Design an enzyme around this catalytic site. Structure first.
Site, mmCIF file in Angstrom:
data_model
loop_
_atom_site.group_PDB
_atom_site.id
_atom_site.type_symbol
_atom_site.label_atom_id
_atom_site.label_comp_id
_atom_site.label_asym_id
_atom_site.label_seq_id
_atom_site.Cartn_x
_atom_site.Cartn_y
_atom_site.Cartn_z
ATOM 1 C CB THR A 1 -1.357 -0.012 0.801
ATOM 2 O OG1 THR A 1 -0.091 -0.132 2.131
ATOM 3 C CG2 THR A 1 -1.937 -1.693 1.519
ATOM 4 C CG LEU A 2 2.108 5.118 -0.972
ATOM 5 C CD1 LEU A 2 3.386 5.453 -0.111
ATOM 6 C CD2 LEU A 2 2.151 6.227 -2.139
ATOM 7 C CG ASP A 59 -0.841 -4.370 4.559
ATOM 8 O OD1 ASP A 59 -0.693 -4.519 3.113
ATOM 9 O OD2 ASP A 59 -0.236 -4.922 5.670
ATOM 10 C CG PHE A 109 3.441 0.869 6.028
ATOM 11 C CD1 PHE A 109 3.837 1.708 6.072
ATOM 12 C CD2 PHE A 109 2.202 0.989 5.181
ATOM 13 C CE1 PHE A 109 4.718 2.520 5.119
ATOM 14 C CE2 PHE A 109 2.642 1.255 3.521
ATOM 15 C CZ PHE A 109 3.966 2.545 4.010
#
Lengths: 224, 234, 229, 243, 233, 236, 241, 251
Positions: A1-2, A59, A109
């Site tokens: 992801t980001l 996530d 993360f």
């Protein structure tokens, strides 16, 4: 992801004579406000091992689905009770998937904590996916691992993640004793979580105390 | 009819499909399987006969009762190597369905994705088709159970009791005696033993498990203490 | 190991598989194409096995574009796959060049596709012969694609069964200057008394050009005006 | 070759293409290698029947590295492919590991190349060899743990030989080595034994231009082909002139 | 076919596919080369219909570099592929090693290419036997010869093509070591024992020296064929 | 009922239901030497008779090593055994790298038996004609056997095609192998199987019979040439 | 299965190739094309095979094709396998112009196309191209040229070739009547003379054979023929020779 | 050597013997299915007995699960006959095409366009020797965009014919004569109007069509039909309570 958009709180995992004790709050902050306040974060992946989330929550389900399929795959060849995947094997798997993502750009993360009973000297050769007294473990068969987003993996007696690594851990490194009783364990975690409720913005009540005893995995919901 | 039965992609002149009928003769020379539905749950059986010459295997080693998840069993009839490839395909089908849907794969659709996999090898000309039938069964909580069967070259069929192997026509006449849909699951433990000895010796070579006995409705083991009181006379 | 040419040569110097394919087109429904001075005419009898098939459902005269009409004879399964590649190639030319696909540029592409199956390993030749007609800026045209891959710049011919004796009609009943209306009368006669059949009615599909007009397929009542004579 | 294929087992339990190719290794020039506790000596024949040849471009004793020296048998064209693959893998081993390769490990990679029909890994998928290599090698060297000598076949069975013989006279030279080879032998005892076995099974004489033996000493661990000077003093010894 | 073992082993041990390709060289144009002290004169045999095919389009006697001559024998149609695959590597060596390709490497490449075809899948073995006469790394001239089986060897003088036994047997008797320039071509043009034709329009000779290949005109070849028939009687 | 039509491919099935192309490879394991493995209560020994092609050659190896507690001993063609012994070694090494526990012996044999199955369905590949005597100790002593087709049999005693009809009967009447807790009597029983299934007028065990032991605290130990010929190969 | 393999890329016990010689005799039963080189230019002959009288025979013919503005060939063999080679030859004729900004010499296009024929008899396992044409053109380095390919790929440079059917009787006419230097008008009647004696006739039927010529006037005009221009050539043939 | 058993080898008489052999595979199972089309509706009737192939010992199976009617889309149903292995693959190959048409063309696929794409991929099996022919015929049904009923029938070879009423199975050589005669009892009938009596005007004159081909009594527990009637347009399958209700319409 980001970008950690749906940030979660931290868990506290300690161990004693009757088993692991992992607890966390059910509040997941979205940016700067508590959007969801009834989401669990202590996911069970085996009849003897559990795992906790931190940081990003969206996530975290991707890693949970990756580990729950390995449980059914391992249960497909359970021709003996000693063939079950120990928590050390689950910890080395999560530490491996985190390192592969570390080589790439997407890191997923999280601050995954894998805890469970690292032994098979207790009768559990009948697993039920969907649905008397405790025992005494030698302190060497109670594995509690930690996995950072960079892939850092290790194991201790007590593992504290996220924001409680600066608040609950300092209160835990001097008050934790070896082979504590069952009541002394939750009287210490509830006392350390009270400090996290006063000195952290993305934290609240609705504790989800999960204990991994020698007879299964339980669940509770106190309110401090 | 001469020269047409070599490959599997060639059709025989009388409309028959050769190289597939020969497969049925191959599974009719191996060990048989048995799976009959009861009023409480499904109980399988796997009568082994070719293990009578080895005599050096464990008492519960050659187990042919696999499963894919908590409540679906899969057995074989024939080649134990070719059918293991379909076992990993069935376990991968439940895993792919669990990723994409977070729910246990239903039985009326797992039998379709497996039957297409077996049939896919019949269409090709450079691959060998599978030589082992498959019995797939489960038992829902509210709805009753169902016993599917995937013979070679597709053709999935829903059953209520089925025996396939070297004595498929012999054991079927025994199940047709009593209405097994309304008897019991523990009564059927000693009832199938009254069929193996008749149609083969006093050995613990037949390994068998059940899917439901109101014991969390999941795949259980053989339960050694239940197999000991065997009515060896009646 | 799964790709090797099945249409190999022979000691007499001919592809036996190609001649075996020509026996399939020589045993199919007749397909007649006739060009003229002001248009091109393509006709094909539709053998009706029963009264259950919709006459508007099956077809032997399809449209490649708004000006190119095609007519096949032979395997109907191999025609729909060749028609799809004909329309797809009529679009790729129309995408690069804004004009309409020319018949010589279309036949030379379809001839390269049907010939490719004669040499590609693992496939059989196309069991059909086409009849491509169409209005072009360089005049009217009519081509026939042989299953071998070659094409002929025909003027008036037939490709179905009995294509030898039925073709003798055009060797005597055809001039170098015939109108479009006169071509319909000579096209029906090549399918009515050249074969025993039955009284040809509502079983003959005819395609016209109508002097640079868009490709129009005649109806069952429109052909009645020509079938009466 | 009549519609049987390469991968086809015989009713006796053997491959058809393997036993069909095993008969081709008994047609080249004969060779003999002896492995003693002091070193390893190799030997071959220089069939230069056509006088117009340069007699230098043809050599039945090539080299894989400074440690490993090997012979050839059977198809001489296919021998240059296995040796070139051996010269690369052994030299590639020197880059990954600073020490030299072991003969036991060097023979494994050559034996794996002769059976590239049922493999499923990489490093050989760039060019899958369709037919088996009809060439029997006589690999020998002084890697470590004392000098060794191995002998490969197209079947893949690589048996370590103390003293073997390949070529057209591989059967006529086996009886001489099975009865004259001693356990403890020096270089001179092995150099003369490598020539007397090449004298009985030979249609010509052991002159300078007929034999091209090479030795790999144990001290320096470096192969060295015997030139025209050292080959002339050893043929003039004649420890057993019998006829 | 496609990825199929065309070159398989016969039930006795030989390669039936290579044995047929080697037999195809027998039905081809002959050629002969001969090494000397510091030069190498080649000689190829050709046959064409008169009053047609004037330049011959240089069938044999092909150049690979500034000092690498090549003469083949056998399938002339296959020489268009073997030479182009050789000449490409002749320049690749000059691009990677920055040195002109020696004859030791070129001959080892043609033997590597021909052996690759008798070992790969779905390929036909090259039915062509060549001979490469060039220069080594130093100023040494060595004449190689690659048979269709994949085996190569240097030669002081060699002859391949149609009936390469009688022409090679004649060359094994009167071959001198350091033959003179005008005397070595006398021996090369004395190899007309194979082709029964004493016309100068059938044999083409060359001369490779000083890293530049020079041909031989029809004028000096006519005076040289004038002495062949007189030497017979 | 034919040996000329239904025989030149792995795909063709015989009319009675057999697969003659893989049964021919199954008969290849009956051409090599013999290998007997005995499983005790807490130990597993593997005895393998090597083979000498000539008097000057050395006997080729038969018993290999896969990991610290997993060892095999092939029976059949050795070129296909090198593909399986290099595959099983990479599977145990990858498990010690991706994870840190020892590889499960049942999961390892499940991965090597599937390698046989993959080479039985396609037409280009051939069946691996070689038997694998997988004998290891993970948590309980286990002995497995593969065939050219995918099969597992947690055996207690075996042999491999050389003189198996003379070795199976010796082990079929010996049920005392379990209670023989003493490792010294177990290796004598395993060596007695090779003595009773040897060709006539042949040497018994002249330091050319590989013997390896694996057990509770014993890793894949290879018996040296100074411990078996002194007493273990001199009791009879 | 591999039992259906015809083995089109396998040698014979006599050293030759079966599929090459089978296609070589396959083109020997096709039409006959005439090749001729004169001082003014190159002239290619053809022979339209008769199918029926319903062919156009006025706008186009399927024997002589154009590769570029300076290279043209006459197909003599299987017309199906030729269109894929003409399409492959036009691409190689334009790939050289795009990569070198110059016209491609005819001596290089033959090598670029014979390698395509040679590669089919080398690997892949497919049947060879059953065609061979008289490809000729004009370059700036060696003047007019004419090459004759084969189904195997061994091309050759010529002056007068008459491949196709009845080549023996056709080559005998060009072997004795082709002068070393002929003009365009005299050369056109030579190709017409050897063509009438090839089909066992005396004069063409004018709805027959088609010709073409290059005759570079410093621009490579490449003028083909019509059915009316052939009438003037047939009249000059009937007058003296 | 002559090899007429190959899939892509033309016979000397100009024929594909592998297609004719595959057509007999459909007739070898003798599952006769009838499908007619009338006013703004069309109905498909299947035999639903069993597939005449390798041994199928009855009295223990479930007859409610064994069928030959498969809905490709919610408004485009179909019936499959022939080999039971290739019938399930044709439905999945059709469902993978009907689902692909929705994602690439917006509206739902037409009954004609789906049959044209089924016969498109069936020609790939015919032209290529790589695969094997799919011995599976079928009748596709469905309403179009112009609010008209459509019925198409595809054979193992390339035939996207389409009929107003057709019979698939093993009696295709004689059921044509009895279908056209029973169809003339509606065309040249009273035909006063259309009050949406499709369940009474088509279904009644469709079960009787199977009553002539099959001389049995056509037990309601072994016969199941399906309609794509307008005002519903959802491939409605008639239940068991109405099959026997229409079976008693002989008088």
């Amino acid at each position: 992801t980001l970008g950690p958009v749906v940030t979660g709180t931290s868990v506290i995992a300690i161990k004693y004579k009757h088993g692991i004790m992992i607890a966390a709050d059910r509040k997941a902050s979205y940016g700067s406000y508590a959007k969801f306040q009834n989401v669990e974060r202590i996911f069970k992946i085996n009849n003897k091992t559990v795992m906790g989330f931190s940081g990003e929550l969206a996530d975290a389900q991707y890693l949970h689905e990756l580990l729950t399929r390995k449980n059914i795959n391992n249960l497909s060849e359970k021709k003996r009770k000693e063939d079950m995947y120990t928590p050390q094997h689950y910890h080395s798997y999560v530490s491996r998937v985190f390192y592969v993502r570390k080589n790439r750009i997407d890191p997923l993360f999280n601050n995954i904590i894998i805890a469970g009973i690292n032994s098979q000297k207790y009768d559990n050769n009948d697993d039920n996916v969907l649905l008397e007294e405790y025992k005494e473990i030698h302190k060497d068969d109670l594995y509690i691992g930690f996995v950072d987003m960079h892939g850092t993996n290790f194991c201790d007696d007590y593992i504290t993640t996220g924001y409680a690594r600066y608040f609950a851990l300092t209160l835990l490194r001097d008050h934790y004793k070896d082979n504590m009783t069952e009541e002394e364990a939750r009287i210490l975690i509830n006392e350390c979580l009270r400090i996290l409720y006063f000195r952290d913005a993305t934290s609240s009540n609705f504790i989800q105390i999960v204990k991994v005893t020698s007879k299964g995995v339980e669940y509770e919901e106190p309110y401090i | 009819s001469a020269g047409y039965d070599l490959s599997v992609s060639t059709f025989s002149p009388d409309g028959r499909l050769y190289q597939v009928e020969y497969i049925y003769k191959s599974i009719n020379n191996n060990n048989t399987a048995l799976c009959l539905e009861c009023k409480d749950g499904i109980i399988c059986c796997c009568i082994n006969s070719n293990m009578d010459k080895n005599k050096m295997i464990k008492k519960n080693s050659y187990n042919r009762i696999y499963h894919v998840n908590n409540n679906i069993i899969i057995t074989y009839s024939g080649f134990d190597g070719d059918a293991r490839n379909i076992i990993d395909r069935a376990r991968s089908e439940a895993n792919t369905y669990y990723y994409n849907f977070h729910t246990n794969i239903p039985l009326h659709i797992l039998v379709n994705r497996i039957s297409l996999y077996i049939h896919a090898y019949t269409l090709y000309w450079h691959m060998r088709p599978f030589a082992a039938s498959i019995i797939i069964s489960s038992f829902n909580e509210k709805d009753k159970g169902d016993i599917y069967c995937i013979e070679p070259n597709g053709a999935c069929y829903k059953y209520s009791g089925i025996v396939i192997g070297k004595n498929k026509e012999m054991f079927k006449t025994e199940i047709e005696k009593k209405d097994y849909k309304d008897i019991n699951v523990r009564d059927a433990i000693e009832d199938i033993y009254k069929f193996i000895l008749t149609s083969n010796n006093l050995q613990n070579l037949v390994n068998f498990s059940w899917i439901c006995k109101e014991s969390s409705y999941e795949f259980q083991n053989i339960h050694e203490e239940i197999l000991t009181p065997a009515l060896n006379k009646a | 190991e799964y790709s090797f040419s099945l249409t190999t040569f022979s000691p007499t110097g001919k592809l036996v598989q190609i001649e075996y394919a020509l026996n399939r087109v020589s045993s199919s429904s007749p397909a007649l194409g006739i060009r003229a001075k002001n248009g091109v005419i393509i006709a094909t009898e539709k053998k009706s096995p029963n009264e259950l098939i919709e006459e508007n459902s099956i077809f032997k005269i399809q449209q490649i574009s708004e000006h190119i009409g095609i007519v096949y004879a032979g395997m109907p399964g191999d025609f729909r796959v060749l028609l799809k590649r004909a329309r797809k190639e009529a679009i790729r030319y129309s995408l690069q060049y804004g004009s309409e696909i020319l018949v010589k540029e279309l036949v030379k592409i379809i001839a390269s596709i049907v010939q490719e199956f004669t040499q590609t390993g693992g496939v059989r030749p196309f069991g059909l012969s086409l009849l491509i007609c169409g209005v072009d800026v360089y005049g009217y045209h009519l081509y026939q694609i042989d299953p071998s891959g070659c094409y002929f710049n025909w003027m008036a011919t037939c490709v179905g069964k009995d294509y030898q004796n039925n073709m003798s009609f055009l060797e005597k009943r055809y001039n170098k200057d015939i109108e479009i209306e006169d071509a319909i009368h000579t096209a029906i006669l090549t399918l009515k008394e050249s074969y025993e059949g039955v009284l040809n009615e509502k079983n003959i599909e005819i395609g016209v050009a109508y002097d640079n007009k868009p490709f129009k397929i005649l109806t069952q009542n429109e052909i009645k005006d020509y079938l009466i004579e | 070759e009549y519609d049987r294929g390469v991968n086809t087992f015989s009713p006796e339990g053997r491959l058809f293409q393997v036993e069909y190719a095993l008969g081709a290794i008994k047609l080249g020039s004969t060779a003999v290698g002896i492995c003693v506790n002091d070193g390893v000596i190799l030997a071959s024949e220089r069939r230069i029947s056509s006088t117009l040849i340069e007699k230098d471009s043809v050599e039945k004793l090539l080299s894989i590295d400074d440690h490993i020296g090997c012979a050839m048998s059977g198809l001489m064209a296919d021998a240059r492919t296995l040796i070139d693959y051996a010269r690369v893998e052994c030299n590639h081993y020197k880059f990954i590991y600073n020490e030299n390769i072991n003969i036991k490990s060097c023979v494994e990679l050559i034996s794996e190349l002769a059976l590239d029909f049922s493999n499923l890994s990489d490093s050989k998928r760039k060019k899958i060899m369709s037919r088996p290599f009809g060439v029997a090698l006589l690999i020998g060297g002084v890697d470590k743990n004392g000098p060794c000598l191995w002998y490969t076949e197209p079947s893949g069975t690589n048996t370590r030989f103390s003293a073997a013989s390949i070529g057209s006279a591989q059967e006529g030279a086996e009886l001489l080595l099975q009865e004259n080879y001693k356990k403890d032998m020096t270089f001179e005892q092995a150099e003369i034994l490598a020539l007397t076995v090449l004298r009985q099974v030979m249609e010509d004489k052991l002159s300078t231009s007929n034999v091209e033996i090479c030795a790999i000493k144990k001290s320096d661990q470096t192969f060295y082909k015997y030139n025209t000077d050292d080959i002339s003093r050893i043929i003039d010894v004649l420890p057993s002139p019998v006829y | 076919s496609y990825d199929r073992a065309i070159t398989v082993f016969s039930p006795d041990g030989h390669l039936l596919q290579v044995e047929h390709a080697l037999e195809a060289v027998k039905k081809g144009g002959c050629a002969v080369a001969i090494k000397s002290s510091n030069f190498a004169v080649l000689a190829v045999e050709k046959k064409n219909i008169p009053k047609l095919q004037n330049p011959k389009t240089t069938e044999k006697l092909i150049k690979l570099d500034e000092h690498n001559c090549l003469a083949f024998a056998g399938l002339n149609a296959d020489a268009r592929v073997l030479v182009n695959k050789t000449r490409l590597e002749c320049q690749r060596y000059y691009l990677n090693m920055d040195e002109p390709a020696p004859v030791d490497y070129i001959a080892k490449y043609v033997a590597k290419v021909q052996q690759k075809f008798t070992h790969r899948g779905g390929v036909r073995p090259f039915g062509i036997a060549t001979l490469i006469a060039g220069f080594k790394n130093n100023k040494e001239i060595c004449i190689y010869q690659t048979e269709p089986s994949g085996i190569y060897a240097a030669w002081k003088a060699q002859a391949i093509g149609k009936n390469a036994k009688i022409v090679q047997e004649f060359l094994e008797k009167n071959y001198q070591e350091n033959m003179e320039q005008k005397d070595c071509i006398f021996l090369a043009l004395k190899a007309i024992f194979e082709v029964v034709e004493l016309s100068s329009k059938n044999v083409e000779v060359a001369l490779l020296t000083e890293k530049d290949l020079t041909f031989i005109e029809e004028q000096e070849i006519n005076s040289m064929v004038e002495l062949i028939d007189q030497e017979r009687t | 009922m034919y040996r000329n039509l239904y025989d030149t491919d792995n795909i063709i099935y015989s009319p009675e239901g057999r697969l003659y192309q893989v049964e021919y490879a199954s008969e290849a394991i009956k051409q090599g030497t013999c290998a007997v493995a005995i499983k005790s209560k807490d130990y597993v020994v593997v005895s393998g008779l090597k083979k000498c092609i000539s008097k000057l050659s050395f006997p080729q190896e038969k018993i290999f090593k896969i990991d610290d507690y997993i060892g095999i001993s092939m029976s059949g063609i050795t070129s296909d055994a090198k593909v399986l012994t290099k595959f099983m070694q990479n599977e145990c090494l990858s498990h010690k790298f991706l994870y840190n526990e020892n590889i499960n012996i049942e999961s390892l044999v499940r991965s090597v038996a599937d390698k046989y199955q993959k080479n039985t369905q396609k037409s280009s590949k051939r069946a691996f004609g070689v038997g694998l005597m997988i004998a290891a100790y993970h948590n309980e002593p286990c002995i497995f056997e593969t065939r050219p087709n995918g099969s597992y049999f947690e055996y207690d005693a075996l042999s491999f095609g050389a003189r198996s009809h003379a070795s199976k009967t010796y082990l079929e009447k010996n049920l005392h192998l379990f209670e023989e807790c003493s490792l010294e009597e177990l290796i004598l029983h395993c060596l007695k199987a090779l003595k009773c299934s040897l060709s006539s007028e042949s040497e018994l065990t002249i330091s050319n019979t590989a013997l390896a032991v694996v057990g509770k605290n014993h890793p894949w130990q290879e018996i040296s040439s100074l411990q078996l010929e002194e007493y273990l190969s001199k009791v009879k | 299965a591999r039992r259906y393999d015809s083995r089109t890329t396998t040698f014979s016990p006599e050293g030759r190739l079966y599929q090459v010689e089978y296609a070589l005799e396959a083109i020997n039963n096709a039409s006959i094309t005439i090749g001729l080189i004169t001082k003014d230019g190159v002239i290619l002959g053809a022979d339209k095979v008769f199918i029926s009288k319903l062919i156009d025979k006025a706008n186009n013919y399927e024997k002589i094709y154009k590769i570029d503005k300076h290279i043209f060939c006459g197909v003599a063999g299987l017309n199906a396998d030729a269109n894929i080679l003409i399409n492959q030859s036009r691409l190689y004729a334009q790939r050289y112009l795009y990569n070198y900004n110059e016209v491609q010499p005819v001596s290089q296009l033959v090598v670029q196309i014979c390698d395509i024929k040679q590669s089919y008899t080398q690997y892949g396992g497919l049947r060879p191209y059953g065609v061979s044409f008289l490809i000729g053109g004009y370059d700036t380095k060696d003047g007019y040229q004419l090459y004759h390919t084969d189904p195997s790929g061994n091309y050759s440079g010529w002056f007068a070739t008459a491949i196709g059917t009845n080549n023996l009787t056709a080559s005998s006419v060009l072997k004795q009547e082709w002068k070393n230097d002929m003009t365009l008008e005299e050369g056109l009647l030579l190709a017409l003379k050897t063509l009438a004696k090839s089909t066992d006739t005396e004069i063409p039927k004018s709805e027959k054979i088609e010709l073409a010529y290059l005759t570079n006037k410093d621009g490579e005009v490449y003028q083909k023929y019509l059915t009316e221009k052939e009438i003037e050539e047939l009249i000059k043939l009937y007058t003296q020779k | 050597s002559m090899y007429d058993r190959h899939l892509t080898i033309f016979s000397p008489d100009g024929n594909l013997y592998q297609i004719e052999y595959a057509i007999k595979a459909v007739k070898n199972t003798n599952i006769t299915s009838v499908g007619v089309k009338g006013e703004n509706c069309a109905v498909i009737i299947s035999q639903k007995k069993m597939a005449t192939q390798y041994i199928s010992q009855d009295k223990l199976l479930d007859y409610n699960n064994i069928t030959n009617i498969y809905n490709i889309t919610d408004e485009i149903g179909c019936s499959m006959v022939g080999m039971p292995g290739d019938c399930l693959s044709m439905v999945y190959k059709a469902r993978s095409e009907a689902s692909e048409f929705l994602y690439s063309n917006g509206y739902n696929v037409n009954a004609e366009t789906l049959c044209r794409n089924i016969c498109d991929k069936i020609q790939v099996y015919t032209q290529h020797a790589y695969m094997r022919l799919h011995a599976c015929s079928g009748m596709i049904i469905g309403i179009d965009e112009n609010n008209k009923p459509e019925l198409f029938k595809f054979d193992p070879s390339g035939f996207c014919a389409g009929y107003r009423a057709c019979v698939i199975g093993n009696k295709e050589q004689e059921s044509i004569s009895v279908l056209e005669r029973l169809l003339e009892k509606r065309k040249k009938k009273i035909q006063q109007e259309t009050i949406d009596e499709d369940i009474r005007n088509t279904t009644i004159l469709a079960i009787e069509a199977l009553q002539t081909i099959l001389a049995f009594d056509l037990k309601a527990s072994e016969i199941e039909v399906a309609i794509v009637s307008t005002k519903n347009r959802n491939f409605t399958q008639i239940s068991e309570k109405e099959i026997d209700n229409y079976l008693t319409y002989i008088a």
